Amino acid sequence: LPLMLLPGRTAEGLTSLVTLLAPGTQARVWHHDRRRIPLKTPLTMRVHHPVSLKSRPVMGDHATDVNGQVLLQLSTQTGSEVQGWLPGGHLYSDLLALLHVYLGSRLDVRLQLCVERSLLPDARLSCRPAAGSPQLGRTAVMRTQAKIATSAARVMTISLGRYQRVQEHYQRKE
Amino acid sequence: MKIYRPLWEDGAFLMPQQFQQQAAWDVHLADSVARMGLAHPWGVVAAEFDDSLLPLSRLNATRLIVRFPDGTLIDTERADNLPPVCDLSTVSDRSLVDIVLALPLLNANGGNLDNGSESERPRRWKS
Amino acid sequence: MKIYRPLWEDGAFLMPQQFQQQAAWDVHLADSVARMGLAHPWGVVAAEFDDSLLPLSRLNATRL
Amino acid sequence: MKIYRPLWEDGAFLMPQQFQQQAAWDVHLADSVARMGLAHPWGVVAAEFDDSLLPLSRLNATRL
Amino acid sequence: MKIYRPLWEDGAFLMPQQFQQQAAWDVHLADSVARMGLAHPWGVVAAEFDDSLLPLSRLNATRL
Amino acid sequence: ERVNVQELAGHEQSEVAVLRHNLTLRMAHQENAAWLTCPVTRLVRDAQGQWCRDPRFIPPLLTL
Amino acid sequence: ERVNVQELAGHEQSEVAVLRHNLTLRMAHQENAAWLTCPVTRLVRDAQGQWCRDPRFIPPLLTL
C-alpha cells in the first residue's frame, strides 16, 4: 500500500514483492532488453512506382521493439524453495500479483532463475516433466561438487488479442 | 535453408530446435537415396474422388497419396486430413477448370499457422 | 539517354528509378576512364565453339 | 574526408548516409585506376559557345 | 566464380543480397579496365613506419 | 525536383529528385578561393569596341 | 560449434551446440592409415613452372 500510492511507479517495487513472499531470494532488474518479433503483416519493402515513403519505416523483414519487456532474475539457496518456483508452487503467487494489482496492462515481464545444477527427473507421464523449456539434472555421474547455471525461463505476464473483425458504422459528422 | 544437426553429450538442455533439425536431416537422406537413377519432379501415387455433387457446384476429394518434389509426403490415411470442398460458383465456361492440389511453402522464419491472426501467405499448422 | 544522378536527402523515398539510373551512371564511368579502348572500338577476349554439330548443320557456343 | 564502406545488415535502420557513402566509394575507385598510367589533374572536352549576344556583354555556353 | 547482377523492377522486396552483388560487380568492371593496359598483381602505394619503438623490438605502421 | 523519369519495364512514369551541380562562370582576375577552377576561354575586345573570341587559346586538354 | 538457430514455430532463437566433421586434405604419397579417403583432383606442373589441373582423370562418380 505505500508502494501502490505513487502514480506510474516503479521498478524498485518488484524487489519488495519477491523479498516479501519468500526470503532467501533476491531480485535484479534490467530495464531494457532485446525483444523480438512482431511480424508486420505487409512486408513493405516492395520498392514502389506510384507512391512510397521513407522518413521513419526502414527495415528488413522482422522488426525489433525494445520498449517494455523487462528481465527479472531470482536467486535462491534453500532447496525447499527451488521446488517452489517450478510451476505449481510459488509461481501462481507472482503470476496473479502482477497482472491485476501492480502492473496490469502497463508492460510485459520476463522471468529467469539461476541455481546450482538442478533437481530434475525425466520422461515420466502426463504432467510434471518440463522444467520450463529446458531439461537437466540427470547426467552428472562424474564429479562431486558445484557448477553454477542459469535455470530456465518462465512465460511473460501478457494479455492481448485482436477479437476478429471488420466494422459497419461510424462516429459522427461534426 | 541450412540443415543443422546437434550433439548430445553429458547433460544438454532439451531444446525444440534439436529435434526439428534431426527430423529434417533424415527426410533429406530419403531423397538422396531416392535420386540414384530417377528423375524427381515427383508426383502422385493415388487420387480418388467423389462424383455425387457434380450436378451442384461442389467437389470433394476422398483419398490422396502425393509425394511433392521437395520430398514431403502426403498419405491421407495417416497423419493428414482431407481438404475442404472446392467451389464452382465463379465459373463462366466449363473447359477452363484444371484442379491442382496446393500446399503452402515453408520459410526459415515462420512456422505454424496460428489461428487468431491473419496473413497474406499461409503455412502448415498445428491442428 | 539523359542518365540522371539521384539525390538522397532526409526525405528521399524509394522508387525503382532511383536505382536503375544509379547503376547506369557507373557503367558510363567505365568508358570515360578508357583512353585506349576508345582509340579502337570494343573488344572480344574469348570465343570458343564446337564443330561436332556441323554434320547435323547445327551450331552452339561454349564460351562467349 | 574519409569514405566508409557501409555494412548491409538485415533487420536494421536504413539511413541516407549509407546510400551516399556507398556511391562515393565507387567514384573514388575509378580515380585510382585512372592514375596508373596517366599523371595529371585533367580537364575539358569540347567547350562550345554562342556568339549572337556579343554585341552586348552577354554569354551563352551551350555544351560542356 | 559466379557474380549475379540483380534486376530492379516494381515487385521485388528489398534484400541484402542485391546490394552486395551490385557492389561486387563494380569491382569487376573497374578491374577489366586495368587489364586493357597494364598486366600485374598489385603492389604498394605507400608504406611508412615509425623508428621510435624499434630499440624495444616493437614495430608499428603509420600509413599504408 | 519533379523530373519525369520513366521506369524501364514498360509501365508509366513518375517524379524523382535529381542532383544538379551549381555551376557558374567566373573571371579569373577576381578572387576564387572557395571554388574549383578550370580555364575555358579568352575573350579580346575588337578594335570596333565589340568582343571577339581569341583564335589562339588552348585549355587544359583531355582530348585532342 | 555454437550458433543461434531459429525455432520453426514463430519464436526467438537461442544457442545450441551443433556438430561439424573434422575434414582435411592430404596427399596420396603421405601415410593414410588412420583416415578414410576418397580422391578429388590431380595436379600437374606446367611449362612455365606453374601448377594446373588435368581434365583427363575421373573421380568415383555417384553422378555424371
Automatic annotation (TrEMBL), chain A:
Source organism superkingdom: Bacteria
Name the UniProt record assigns to this protein: Type VI secretion system baseplate subunit TssG
Lineage: Bacteria, Pseudomonadati, Pseudomonadota, Gammaproteobacteria, Enterobacterales
Portion of the full sequence shown: 184 to 357 of 366
UniProtKB/TrEMBL annotation, chain B:
Originating organism: Escherichia coli (strain 55989 / EAEC)
Top-rank taxon, per record: Bacteria
First and last residues shown, out of full length: 1 to 127 of 445
Protein name: Type VI secretion system baseplate subunit TssK
